[PDB]
Every structure is written in C-alpha cells, then in structure tokens.
Amino acid sequence: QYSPNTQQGRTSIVHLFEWRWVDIALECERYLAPKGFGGVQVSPPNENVAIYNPFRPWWERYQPVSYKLCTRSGNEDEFRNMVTRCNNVGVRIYVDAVINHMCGNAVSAGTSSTCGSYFNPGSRDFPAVPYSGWDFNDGKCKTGSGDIENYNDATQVRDCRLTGLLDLALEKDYVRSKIAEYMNHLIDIGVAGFRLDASKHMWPGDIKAILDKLHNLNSNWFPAGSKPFIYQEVIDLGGEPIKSSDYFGNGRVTEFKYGAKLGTVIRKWNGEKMSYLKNWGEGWGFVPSDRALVFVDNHDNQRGHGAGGASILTFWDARLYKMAVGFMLAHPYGFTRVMSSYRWPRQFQNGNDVNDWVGPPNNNGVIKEVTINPDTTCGNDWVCEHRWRQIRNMVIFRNVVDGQPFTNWYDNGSNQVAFGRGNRGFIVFNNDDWSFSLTLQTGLPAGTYCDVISGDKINGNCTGIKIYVSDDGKAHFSISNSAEDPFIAIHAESKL
Ligand SMILES: *[C@@H]1O[C@H](CO)[C@@H](O)[C@H](O)[C@H]1NC(C)=O
Ligand SMILES: [Ca+2]
Ligand SMILES: [Cl-]
C-alpha cells in the first residue's frame, strides 16, 4: 500500500481539484504525460448531495449519497474513459475515497443529489447503496450531541459525527463490504490508489479490514500482485491523542505538519528561517519519509481554516508559494503532491474568508471546461499551478534527481540556503531582504546548466539564467531579493 504505482522515474501526483473527467483525460494526454507527472488525485467520484444554500460549494462532494460514479465531474462512462486514457499514457489516477460518513444528518430528504438518487438523512435511509439506520454509529457514539465534541477523547473522534456527518458503522462486515464493493469497482476500472478521506475519524483496524477486501490493481496495466497506493488523510499536528503512526500498517499518511511548518519558515514567522531547514524531515517531528504524503497546501487548508491555519502558502501567495513548492520538490523527504486550484472571490472579513465555500468555476452549477491558453496557462479561472514553469520544471527536477542523496547543504545563518541531490541536481534559495551572490559547491559535473526556474533548456540553449559549473564542481550564483523568483535550480537534464 506504500508504493505509488507510478511509472519509474515519475515522482509526483497533482490534485486536479474539481476538474471534470473529460478535462483530466485530455490533460493526461497533452501535458501530464509529456511533462513527467506521475498521476492525478481526482475529486470524489461518487454521488454526493447537491447543496444549493450556499450554491454548489466545493464541500458538497464530501457528503456522499451513494457509490454511483455520477458527479459534477461526470458519469461512469466518462470516469472510465479518463482512467483508461490516463493509464494508456502512463499517468495514474488516485481516488478521493469518502468512506467515513454519508451526508450531514440535517440535510433535507429528497433527490437533491448529483445522480438524482433518493436519500433521507433523518431516517438514515440511503437506498442507492443501500444503507439503513443499522449501518450508522448513532448507538455507539457516547456524546450528548452525537457529534465530535472533544478531540482529547480518541473514541468519540472515531464513533461520533464529524460536524454532523452521518458516521458509518465501519466495524460491520456489511458496511466494510459496501465500501470495498465501491473501491473494487474503481480498482477494476484501473485506479492506482486512494486518498482515504477523514482517516483520523476511522479506527486503524476498520480501515485495515476494508483494505483486506481490496483487489490488486488491474492486470491489463499493472504487474500482477500490485497493491493500491493508500494515503490516509490524518490531520496530526501534535497535542492530541490520535497519532498518525497508528495508521502506518495501512498505508502512507498525509503529513500536515509539512506544509504548516514550511509555511511558517518561508513566511519567517516566529523567528523561523530557511537556514533551519538543514535537518528537514523526521528531525522536525514528521513521520518517516516512507510513510509521508507531502504537500504545501491542500484543497481544504488553502482556504485558511484547515490544518496549519494562516501559515499555509497558496497560489494567492505566488512568489513565496513557488519557493515553498520548489523546496518540497527538491528535498528527498516524502512522496510529493502538487496542488492545482481554481480562483474564487476570496473576501476576508475579520480575518476569515466569507467566500471560502465557493465551488469550482461554473455556469449555473455546471463546471466549466479547462481551457488552455497559447502561453500554456489555463483560462476559465482555473489556476493550473502545475503548469507554472517554476512548478512544472521542479516536478521534472524531482524525477531527474530521484534516488540521489541530500548533500552539499549551504546556509548563511539566515534565509539564503542551497543543497544538492547527489550529482544530479542543485538548488539555491534567497529568502532574505538582500542579495545572495556566492560561489557554491554544486556536486555536479562541469558544464553550462540552464536555470529551470527563470527559464528552460530549449533548442540547446537556455532561455533564462545560465550557471557555469567548473571542474571543481563550484558555480557562482547571484539572486537579488528583487528577482521575480528568488531561487535557481539546475539539474543533469538542464545541462547544455
Ligand atoms: C542557441 O542560440 C544561439 C544564439 O541565438 C543560436 O545561434 C544557436 O543556433 C542556438 N542553438 C544552439 C544549439 O547553439
Ligand atoms: Ca467515524
Ligand atoms: Cl489531503
């Protein structure tokens, strides 16, 4: 469950948050395959509540109605078409599996659902699954409200309703089997793995029992006996009884400390400084690298109220965000996920964004196509961070340097740092309020290298900065604090 099942030499996943299946299929073919991306995390592909107050929020997709593959992203045939097309170009699909819960207990009964299935939260009736009252934790939860009230009680965190979401009775073989039926439908379609949503709200052993029911990956595309990649969304920032290590026997875990701390460092909050990153990884209290799914931001915490709060860097913070993403993609810790977002009219009142619910770009609730501009950016309010030169080129950097050790660290005791990845890549950052001009040991073979942040290697030339590595492995780097991107990255495949 720990291996991503990407092609060898492809080392990241991208979250194409709220994208439609047909757009992901096209993106696999036209961009993700040629640019070296390992795979795509898709939004939940199962039927959810259609919520109209407020209007079609992103978070309606975390309120299941059934396991029909029928959502605003598309129907089952469209989902299968995407998985097939992506697998056929060697780009994997990972499903966001919403399996802890059904919808909010106070949602009105009816057919306000993305496939029109009937459901009745108040009577616990989800006939399109089917689930009934026997399949929820009403009787097991011991809190006075029926909801999670106190995260210091690890039992109620698992047995009670997360902000009122009806909590499935995951100890029951019937329920485990309905979840496995859904997940095996997806595996047999060709998905390579899963994000397990709300994993802190499930017992490790119930997750294990579900995983024990799962198939190996579809043998038309994957070697025999390949296990689905599992990454469990466990928010563990310390200071609560639940530890993400309890989940290591099932798969990887999301390491939310990663982006929280990287954000604080890059923002220079509380005296933190990039020079402190020399021992980034387990030295910062993180999970073992081989159990980590890492990211700068995710779809929930990029809205400011998630794990990490205001420290999280996002596309709105583009300059610092590119630096953070670049550090992540250069550093060997973890398996990396890049975010790809949509723009919304963020409107802070009293320090909080009142429009943080807004769903994906849409016309009357129908999600807009992703259009591609001549300059390779996206239209229709899709941000497409994964197409930013500085991010895409660092996705490639990570591939190029795969397996190479962290080495040749330098820092100035403040926020000018650099390091290499064996003899295959080198990266230099200036997050101080002055220039960084110094000759550094790069570990690379002598030659001329294109900086892949300011430019590209195209037609045997560099379009941006060029770095000259001498026979001693040293090269001079100059980065003004006024530079568009105050970091430089070079690697074996950017050498002229
Ligand atoms: C690189 O750029 C120079 C200057 O524009 C040009 O003469 C040359 O043809 C380009 N390509 C190579 C491979 O040198
Ligand atoms: Ca639960
Ligand atoms: Cl996540």
Residues in a beta bridge with 410: 418
The token duo for 30 is: 């036209």
How many CB atoms neighbour CB 183 within 10 A?
Answer: 23
Instruction: Match 């979840």 to its residue by tokens.
Output: 179
Instruction: Match 């050498």 to its residue by tokens.
Output: 495
Let me know whether 141 and 16 are in one domain.
Answer: yes
For ligand 1, atom 6, name the residue with the nearest CA: 461
Residue 171's CATH number: 3.20.20.80
The token duo for 352 is: 């909080």
Residue 222's alpha-carbon distances to 27, 187, 218, 307, in angstroms, are 21, 11, 6, 35
CA distance 277 to 261: 10
* Widest pairwise Cα distance in the chain: 75
Q: Ligand 1 centre from 489 Cα, in Å?
A: 22
Let me know whether 189 and 294 are in one domain.
Answer: yes
**Nearest Cα to Cα of residue 316 among 385, 391, 269:** 385
Let me know whether 388 and 414 are in one domain.
Answer: no
CA distance 230 to 114: 26
For ligand 1, atom 7, name the residue with the nearest CA: 461
Q: What is the DSSP letter of 268?
A: T
**Nearest Cα to Cα of residue 68 among 14, 114, 19, 18:** 114
Q: What is the DSSP string of 75-104?
A: -HHHHHHHHHHHHHTT-EEEEEE--SEEEE
Q: Which ligand is nearest to the CA of 231?
A: 3
Q: Which ligand is nearest to the CA of 307?
A: 3
Length of the chain: 496
Residue 328's alpha-carbon distances to 4, 263, 332, in angstroms, are 18, 11, 8
Let me know whether 59 and 136 are in one domain.
Answer: yes
Q: Which ligand is nearest to the CA of 199?
A: 2
Q: What is the DSSP letter of 126?
A: B
For the Cβ of 460 lying below 6 angstroms from any atom of ligand 1, the answer is yes
What ligand 1 atom has the least distance to the C-alpha of 460? 13
Relative to beta strand 12-16, strand 335-340 is parallel
Confirm if 127 and 118 have CB atoms less than 8 A apart: yes
CA distance 359 to 68: 21
CA distance 200 to 65: 21
Q: Ligand 3 centre from 463 Cα, in Å?
A: 36
CA distance 77 to 99: 22
For ligand 1, atom 13, name the residue with the nearest CA: 460
CA distance 51 to 30: 33
Q: Ligand 3 centre from 85 Cα, in Å?
A: 25
Q: Which residues are annotated as a binding site?
A: 100, 158, 167, 195, 201, 298, 337
Angle between helices 389-400 and 318-330 (to 10 degrees): 10
For the Cβ of 459 lying below 6 angstroms from any atom of ligand 1, the answer is yes
Relative to beta strand 362-363, strand 252-254 is unpaired
Q: How far is C-alpha 477 from the geometric centre of its chain's CA atoms?
A: 32
Q: Which ligand is nearest to the CA of 171?
A: 2
Let me know whether 161 and 275 are in one domain.
Answer: yes
> What is the CA angle 102-103-106, rounded to 5?
135
Query: What sign does the dihedral 259-16-403-413 (CA atoms) show?
Result: negative
CA distance 299 to 288: 23
For ligand 1, atom 5, name the residue with the nearest CA: 461
For the Cβ of 458 lying below 6 angstroms from any atom of ligand 1, the answer is no
Q: Ligand 2 centre from 217 Cα, in Å?
A: 27
Query: What sign does the dihedral 379-381-385-389 (CA atoms) show?
Result: positive
Residue 367's alpha-carbon distances to 58, 73, 141, in angstroms, are 11, 7, 37
For the Cβ of 345 lying below 6 angstroms from any atom of ligand 1, the answer is no
The domain boundary, picked from 403, 421, 436, lies at 403
CA distance 56 to 314: 22
CA distance 169 to 22: 35
First to last CA, the chain: 39
Let me know whether 137 and 253 are in one domain.
Answer: yes
Q: Ligand 3 centre from 191 Cα, in Å?
A: 18
Confirm if 436 and 454 have CB atoms less than 8 A apart: no
Reported as type and span, the H/E element at residue 487 is: strand 487-491
CA distance 306 to 303: 7
CA distance 29 to 36: 11
Let me know whether 372 and 414 are in one domain.
Answer: no
Q: How many domains does the chain fold into?
A: 2
Residue type present at position 251: G
CA distance 291 to 250: 10
Annotated catalytic residue: which of 47, 60, 233, 255? Answer: 233
- The pick from 450, 456, 461, 466 for probing ligand 1's pocket by mutation, whose C-beta has the most ligand atoms within 8 angstroms, reads 461
What ligand 1 atom has the least distance to the C-alpha of 461? 1
Confirm if 70 and 114 have CB atoms less than 8 A apart: yes
For ligand 1, atom 3, name the residue with the nearest CA: 461
Annotated catalytic residue: which of 18, 60, 159, 197? Answer: 197
Reported as type and span, the H/E element at residue 348 is: strand 348-349
The token duo for 413 is: 């005791």
Q: Using omega within 30 degrees of 0 as the cis cutoff, is the peptide bond preceding 54 cis?
A: yes
**Does the annotation count 381 as an active-site position?**
no
Q: Which residues contact 20 (CB under 8 A, 6 or more apart)?
A: 72, 73, 74, 78, 367, 369, 370
CA distance 261 to 267: 10
Q: Which residues contact 44 (CB under 8 A, 6 or more apart)?
A: 61, 62, 64, 71, 95, 96, 97, 98, 197
Let me know whether 391 and 436 are in one domain.
Answer: no
The domain boundary, picked from 381, 403, 425, lies at 403
Residue 493's CATH number: 2.60.40.1180
How many CB atoms neighbour CB 409 within 10 A?
Answer: 13
Q: Ligand 2 centre from 201 Cα, in Å?
A: 4
Alpha-helix runs per DSSP H in 268-361: 318-330
**Nearest Cα to Cα of residue 361 among 12, 14, 23:** 23
Let me know whether 318 and 440 are in one domain.
Answer: no
Q: Which residues are annotated as a binding site for chloride?
A: 195, 298, 337
Q: Ligand 1 centre from 496 Cα, in Å?
A: 11
What was the resolution (in A) of this experimentally determined structure? 0.9
The token duo for 132 is: 């009934």
Confirm if 105 and 165 have CB atoms less than 8 A apart: yes
Relative to beta strand 101-104, strand 165-167 is antiparallel
For the Cβ of 496 lying below 6 angstroms from any atom of ligand 1, the answer is no
The domain boundary, picked from 344, 369, 403, lies at 403
Let me know whether 167 and 213 are in one domain.
Answer: yes
Let me know whether 377 and 485 are in one domain.
Answer: no
Q: What's the domain range around 456?
A: 404-496
Let me know whether 243 and 150 are in one domain.
Answer: yes
The token duo for 89 is: 């170009």
**φ and ψ at 121, to 5 degrees?**
-60, -40
Burial zone of 253 (CB within 10 Å; 0-12 exposed, 13-18 middle, 19+ buried): buried
